[PDB]
């Protein structure tokens, strides 16, 4: 269960 199909940005945190 992701918020959508694809992230807006590369993981960074």
């Amino acid at each position: 269960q992701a918020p959508s199909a694809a992230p807006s940005a590369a993981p960074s945190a």
Partner: antibody
Amino acid sequence: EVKLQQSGAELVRPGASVKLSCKALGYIFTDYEMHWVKQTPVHGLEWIGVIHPGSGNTVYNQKFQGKATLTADKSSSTAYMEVSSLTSEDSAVYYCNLWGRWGQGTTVTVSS
Amino acid sequence: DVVMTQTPVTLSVNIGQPASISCKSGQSLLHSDGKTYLNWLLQRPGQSPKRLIYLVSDLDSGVPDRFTSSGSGTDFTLEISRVEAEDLGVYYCWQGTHLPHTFGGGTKLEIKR
């Protein structure tokens, strides 16, 4: 469905701080990096930082180091941003967003 | 900050006519992980932005087929085949490749009638 629910509008005094909330629903909160964004008609959209709610790790924009502090409660699926030492330049709409899904935003007015 | 520059600042278009908006970055948005994190938002006055496009060329859910986007490296494009009335607002490009993440200034799509 996927839904980011932010806290309501705030009037806050210069020099004070404010903490904004953002509740995530419809996805695994702890697994996906939550972003915060500032919007003004003079500077447009600016990226503040990102929190991994799972780990609690944060990356800040240099421009917002100290001004902004990102927090998360795994229990309530809620992200938090405290903005401190408030000046006129801090009146804005604040958004949480991740993966192209955005909260409704919170209007913050700095005034005495 | 990787500087995101959109053109034009304002686009005036008749309904049914094409529209194209350019987005250029200071440097490449090709991430070392292979993905190019260039996105397209649409915002109306007093409302949250809406993601329309991710990873350069991919339409998000609900987004009509009349919307297309491509590019790579620095230069990028959003095209509307035939503009509809509801397509108006400010279109923002933004990059999630480089830290800090940075947004274009916006292109406002206005409808002629």
